[PDB]
Amino acid sequence: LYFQSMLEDVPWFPRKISELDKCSHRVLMYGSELDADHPGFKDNVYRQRRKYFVDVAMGYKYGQPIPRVEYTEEETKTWGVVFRELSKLYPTHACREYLKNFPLLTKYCGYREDNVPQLEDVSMFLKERSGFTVRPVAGYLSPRDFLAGLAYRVFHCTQYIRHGSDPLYTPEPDTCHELLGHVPLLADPKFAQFSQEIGLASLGASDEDVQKLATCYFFTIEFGLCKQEGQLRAYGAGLLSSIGELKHALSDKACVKAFDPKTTCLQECLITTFQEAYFVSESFEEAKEKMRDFAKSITRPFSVYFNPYTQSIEILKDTRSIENVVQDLRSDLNTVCDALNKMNQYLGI
Ligand SMILES: [Fe+3]
């Protein structure tokens, strides 16, 4: 009864991976709902495709594999233009994590200019490498629902291609943005943990706090820089997608600051580019540390613990669940000691 009353005071969140379906289908604005200033607003042929990707995404259910999508010649050509113009900047703008996983994506997921990668290939790739998976989404989800996905290391992705009239421009996150922006970093473990941190911190949180985490998501996952060996590199997906803002964030005429969760979450997210400032993290371990610490400030009666074996959320409400966690850590520390002893036994140190 005590636990029942505890959850009634906080917003609903999926406690099982199967319950995440409720978040995936709560689309506030479907992809077929083109904006008035959209370059394909009068394109009936384009609207037909946008409606097609919506229906495909709406048909997705947990456990079922992501259906293969036959992209048209125009859509592949549009992908090809984006793929080339961004590849000319990556070895000088993208972080080390990006350049390490991108060739792997070319090998296993078919990242080419003459072929649009399928989500099912990407999902199996990410799961095997960082535990992340992707889901097709029919449109825009609330920040609460999208972040809830990250708590399970599930990234909701679009499948549609931007309008072919201008491949170097997109008002919305098309599949080119997802595959070339988010995916190559999702394959990195330290980044995956960092992305999952934001998600776990949103579970059961207030709308005000969720909006803050969404802002932190914006100026990191979407528009973030990382200092690697003095040189400045972009890791934000929004930067790795826009060829113009990518070179700008690493230019001299751009205001560059450091990622401070309490201050950054108050910064204004500008959809109409560019951004007023770009925040920098030293690493994805520090970034994870920044969100691991920031979650303490968010008000909720409990703390959450992700169970990767059952893909569920453990609510730490009593001393029993807490003691259970500590005991597991004592077992893991024992394994650490064993490895230490075996190292002394063989390496003589
Ligand atoms: Fe994005």
Q: Write down the experimental method used for this entry.
A: X-ray
Strand-strand pairing, 139-141 and 27-30:
antiparallel
3-state helix, strand, coil in the chain (%, to 5): 50, 15, 35
Q: Active site residue: 156, 182, 195, 242, which one?
A: 182
Nearest to 304 by CA among 6, 31, 93: 6
CA distance 284 to 290: 9
163 catalytic residue (yes or no): no
Nearest to 220 by CA among 264, 154, 263: 264
Residue 166 Cα to ligand 1 middle (Å): 19
- Alpha helices for the chain (secondary structure H): 2-8, 21-24, 44-58, 73-87, 90-93, 96-108, 119-129, 143-150, 175-177, 183-186, 189-202, 207-217, 237-241, 243-249, 261-264, 284-294, 319-347
Residue 1 Cα to ligand 1 middle (Å): 41
CA distance 40 to 34: 8
3-state secondary structure of 12: coil
* 177 annotated as ligand-binding: yes
Are the beta carbons of 321 and 305 closer than 8 angstroms? yes
> Where in the chain are the domains?
1-349
CATH superfamily of 1-349: Aromatic amino acid hydroxylase (1.10.800.10)
222 catalytic residue (yes or no): yes
User: Which token pair is 229?
Assistant: 């060996």
Nearest to 143 by CA among 85, 216, 242: 216
Q: Active site residue: 38, 222, 248, 281, which one?
A: 222
Strand-strand pairing, 303-307 and 312-316:
antiparallel
Are the beta carbons of 194 and 291 closer than 8 angstroms? yes
* 222 annotated as ligand-binding: yes
Are the beta carbons of 55 and 166 closer than 8 angstroms? no
Neighbours of 49 (CB within 10 A): 21
Maximum pairwise Cα distance, the chain: 73
- Alpha helices for 218-318 (secondary structure H): 237-241, 243-249, 261-264, 284-294
Are the beta carbons of 149 and 27 closer than 8 angstroms? no
Q: Active site residue: 93, 156, 177, 248, which one?
A: 177
CA distance 153 to 196: 6
Whether a cis peptide bond, with omega within 30° of 0, leads into 302 is no
User: Which token pair is 263?
Assistant: 């201050």
Nearest to 218 by CA among 210, 208, 230, 227: 210
Which residues in the chain precede a discontinuity of more than 2.5 Å between C and N? none
Residue 221 Cα to ligand 1 middle (Å): 7
Residue 53 Cα to ligand 1 middle (Å): 18
Give Cβ neighbours of residue 177 (< 8 Å, ≥ 6 apart): 158, 170, 237, 238, 241
Nearest to 200 by CA among 142, 153, 134, 131: 153
Resolution in A: 2.6
CA distance 98 to 182: 10
177 catalytic residue (yes or no): yes
Are the beta carbons of 257 and 277 closer than 8 angstroms? yes
Residue 252 Cα to ligand 1 middle (Å): 25
Neighbours of 179 (CB within 10 A): 26
Residue 255 Cα to ligand 1 middle (Å): 21
Residue 178 Cα to ligand 1 middle (Å): 6
| Residues facing 225 on adjacent strands | 234, 280
Q: Which residue has the tokens 């090998």?
A: 107
CA distance 225 to 141: 25
When computed from its CA atoms, the radius of gyration of the chain, rounded to whole angstroms, is 21
Neighbour-count burial of 247, counting CB atoms closer than 10 A to its CB (0-12 exposed, 13-18 middle, 19+ buried): middle
Are the beta carbons of 172 and 161 closer than 8 angstroms? no
3-state secondary structure of 77: helix
Residue 210 Cα to ligand 1 middle (Å): 17
Phi-psi map region of 229: left, alpha, beta (phi>0 left; psi -120 to 50 alpha): left
87 catalytic residue (yes or no): no
CA distance 296 to 23: 24
Neighbours of 213 (CB within 10 A): 26
Nearest to 95 by CA among 198, 184, 207, 175: 184
Residue 29 Cα to ligand 1 middle (Å): 16
Q: What distance, in Å, lies between the first and last C-alpha atoms of the chain? A: 54
- Amino acid in the structure at residue 17: I
Distances (CA, A) of 242 to 50, 225, 274: 22, 14, 10
Give Cβ neighbours of residue 236 (< 8 Å, ≥ 6 apart): 181, 219, 220, 221, 222, 223, 224, 225, 249
Q: Active site residue: 123, 202, 241, 281, which one?
A: 241
* 156 annotated as ligand-binding: no
